[PDB]
């Protein structure tokens, strides 16, 4: 769902 999210990057980094």
């Amino acid at each position: 769902k999210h990057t980094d």
Partner: antibody
Framework: EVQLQQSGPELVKPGASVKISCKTS????????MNWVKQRPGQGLEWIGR????????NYNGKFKDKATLTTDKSSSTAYMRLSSLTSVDSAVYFC???????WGQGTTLTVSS | DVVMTQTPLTLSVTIGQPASISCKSS???????????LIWLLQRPGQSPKRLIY???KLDSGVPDRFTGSGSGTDFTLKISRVEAEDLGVYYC?????????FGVGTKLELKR
């Protein structure tokens, strides 16, 4: 270090459009989501939406789906937000913010006025 | 949309003393991958926001150890063990589990006198 550098302040008339930029450095631009956030004068933060630059995938807040258009230019590591058919209520500071809001731009002030 | 309710709206703090602020979600923020996408941001006056805490309790790089984040179900807390002047500003909680992502209204930390 990651840095998000936004374009400068804008003053436009109602009905106009504007395109604000967010130039990134210090990481692989294509591989992180870019969010945009609105802050009306004296008010709180509002999420507009996000774009994944590698493939153009987007998620919008429905409140803004007819107002904001997110794009990117991977070759210059720059994210863009276009705001259309502007009215007074679109006057705000707009921020770009990466991924899980982990790095933020310095903000762009938009003033819409006749 | 998920509603994030922050209280108090203003907290009058004292340099050297603890502070605690609360953020409650209208929905569970636990995602199917096990992560809880709850973050805390500080917006100092005249500045852009900065992230301090993410995934409920993890401190961002460079954030002082005086900050702690916790959560139980939909009830989240940010604590400062001893307030310092650089901590003053508006604290926002934000959730990134459910679309659209949403922010609380902000809690302002100001100085008591």
């Amino acid at each position: 270090e990651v840095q998000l550098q936004q374009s400068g302040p804008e003053l436009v008339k109602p009905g106009a459009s504007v395109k604000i930029s967010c130039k990134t450095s210090g990481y692989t631009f294509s591989n992180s989501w870019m969010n945009w956030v609105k802050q009306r004068p004296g008010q709180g933060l509002e999420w507009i939406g996000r774009i994944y630059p590698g493939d153009g995938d987007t998620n919008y807040n429905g409140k803004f789906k007819d107002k904001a258009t997110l794009t990117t230019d991977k070759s210059s590591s720059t994210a863009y937000m276009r705001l259309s058919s502007l009215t007074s209520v679109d006057s705000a500071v707009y921020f770009c913010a990466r991924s899980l809001f982990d790095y933020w731009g310095q903000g762009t002030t938009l003033t819409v006025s006749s | 949309d998920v509603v994030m309710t922050q209280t108090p709206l203003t907290l009058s703090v004292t340099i050297g003393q603890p502070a605690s602020i609360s953020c409650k979600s209208s929905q569970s923020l636990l995602d199917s991958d096990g992560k809880t996408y709850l973050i805390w941001l500080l917006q100092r006056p005249g500045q852009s926001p900065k992230r301090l805490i993410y995934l409920v309790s993890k401190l961002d790089s460079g954030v002082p150890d005086r900050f702690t984040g916790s959560g139980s179900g939909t009830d989240f807390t940010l604590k400062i063990s001893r307030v310092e002047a650089e901590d003053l500003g508006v604290y926002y909680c934000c959730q990134g589990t459910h679309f659209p992502f949403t922010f609380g209204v902000g809690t302002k930390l100001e100085l008591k006198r």
